[PDB]
Amino acid sequence: METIEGVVVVGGGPVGLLTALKLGKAGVRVVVLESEPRAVAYMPPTAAALDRFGLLDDIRKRAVWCPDFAYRHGNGELIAKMDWAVLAQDTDYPYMLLLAQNHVSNVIVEHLRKLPNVEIRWNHKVEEIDQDDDYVTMETSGPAGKASLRAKWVAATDGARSTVRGKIGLTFDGITWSERLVATNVFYDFSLHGYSRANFVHDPVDWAVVVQLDKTGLWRVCYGEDPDISEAEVRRRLPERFKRLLPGAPTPDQYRVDYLNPYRVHQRCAAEFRRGRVILAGDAAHATNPMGGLGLSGGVLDAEHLAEALIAVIKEGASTKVLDEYSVDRRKVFLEFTSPTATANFTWMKESDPAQRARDNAMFDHAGKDLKVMREILLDFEKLNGRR
Numbered sequence: 001m002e003t004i005e006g007v008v009v010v011g012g013g014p015v016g017l018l019t020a021l022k023l024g025k026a027g028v029r030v031v032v033l034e035s036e037p038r039a040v041a042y043m044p045p046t047a048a049a050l051d052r053f054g055l056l057d058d059i060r061k062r063a064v065w066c067p068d069f070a071y072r073h074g075n076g077e078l079i080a081k082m083d084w085a086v087l088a089q090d091t092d093y094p095y096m097l098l099l100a101q102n103h104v105s106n107v108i109v110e111h112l113r114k115l116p117n118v119e120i121r122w123n124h125k126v127e128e129i130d131q132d133d134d135y136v137t138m139e140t141s142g143p144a145g146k147a148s149l150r151a152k153w154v155a156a157t158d159g160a161r162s163t164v165r166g167k168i169g170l171t172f173d174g175i176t177w178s179e180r181l182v183a184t185n186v187f188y189d190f191s192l193h194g195y196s197r198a199n200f201v202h203d204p205v206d207w208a209v210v211v212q213l214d215k216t217g218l219w220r221v222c223y224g225e226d227p228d229i230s231e232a233e234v235r236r237r238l239p240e241r242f243k244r245l246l247p248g249a250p251t252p253d254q255y256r257v258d259y260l261n262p263y264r265v266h267q268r269c270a271a272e273f274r275r276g277r278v279i280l281a282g283d284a285a286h287a288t289n290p291m292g293g294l295g296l297s298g299g300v301l302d303a304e305h306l307a308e309a310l311i312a313v314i315k316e317g318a319s320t321k322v323l324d325e326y327s328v329d330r331r332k333v334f335l336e337f338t339s340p341t342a343t344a345n346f347t348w349m350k351e352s353d354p355a356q357r358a359r360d361n362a363m364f365d366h367a368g369k370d371l372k373v374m375r376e377i378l379l380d381f382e383k384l385n386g387r388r
Helices: 014-025 044-053 056-062 101-112 231-245 299-316 321-349 354-369 371-385
Strands: 002-010 030-033 064-066 068-073 078-083 096-098 118-121 125-131 136-142 145-156 172-177 181-187 198-202 208-212 218-224 256-263 266-270 278-280
Touching: 002 014, 002 136, 002 299, 014 030, 014 044, 014 101, 014 118, 014 299, 044 056, 044 299, 044 371, 056 101, 068 354, 078 354, 078 371, 101 118, 145 299, 181 231, 198 321, 198 354, 218 231, 231 256, 266 321, 278 321, 299 321, 321 371, 354 371
Parallel strands: 002 030, 002 145, 030 118, 068 198, 145 278
Antiparallel strands: 064 096, 068 078, 125 136, 136 145, 172 266, 181 218, 181 256, 198 208, 208 218
16 A cells, blocks of 8 residues: 555646645645546736746747637627736736646646656546545556555545545535536637637627637637537537627638537535545536636636645644635635626626616626726736635
């Protein structure tokens, strides 16, 4: 029985990798267990956190620089443009960065690879987990077969229920399923037709998120479709849907669909973010409305705080009260800011009452024209920091 006098991080998404990164940089011994939707937008407080991790330069080189985001009607007409530059006196990072999760993960891997105290186990999954007073014990399956592992502390970061999160007996509350969404990746020059790099389209039927994924010119278009039909019928309907979702009403030859996936997600929030020596972060702890949550995962600031707390315990002899302050603070951010904001944004996006829509359009229009009010709204993202 291999024993790790340090931390085991289960899940090699960005949140897991970041957690390992900051731990590893402080000398803590870390073993990451990676195994097999995606979050792609970084707001200013998140960019500030990435600078502290030392990752912002390498990320800025790959990311799509996004100075503004737009609200639009279903005919593509502009409702309001929010310009991050209005924050140039408030932050060193007055912009949004857009990048697909896999590219972010590859950057973070290159930095971990310079830390000999950090080891990554590819495609190792956690089949069983339990703890006692001293250690967390895990049963793992990898390409080598079954094996056993124990660690002082475990940080679980992965969303599936089959993983650690649904094996330590935590309550999950706020559980709501989504309607049927379709995520597509498209090669279409949206910007040639007046779109911004990130766009919220507000329409009772043809609402959508349109946001750029990487520097190849691939874009993500998320929209709603009838939940009763087969995946085959979804694909058959797309051409006709794109005549409205894409500006200029293109015909099939003007664009290329690289990926198409219907899906549904559960919102949820764990009752407590820690159970003994196991601590949750990111997608293992909570999930926000998928369609209103752009830039609101909280994953990066989760990871920063979690690693700061574990360093204090392991390297500095602090009591585990810091791990409890972590749980309370991040859970407050989700409950009182992130979740409600994502739910409000989605409610505005799909409103069907013509009188409420006009009230909503006037509000966005005004936020777009009065730069002081645009400023106030954009500054609200600083609540991702919580009270730390």
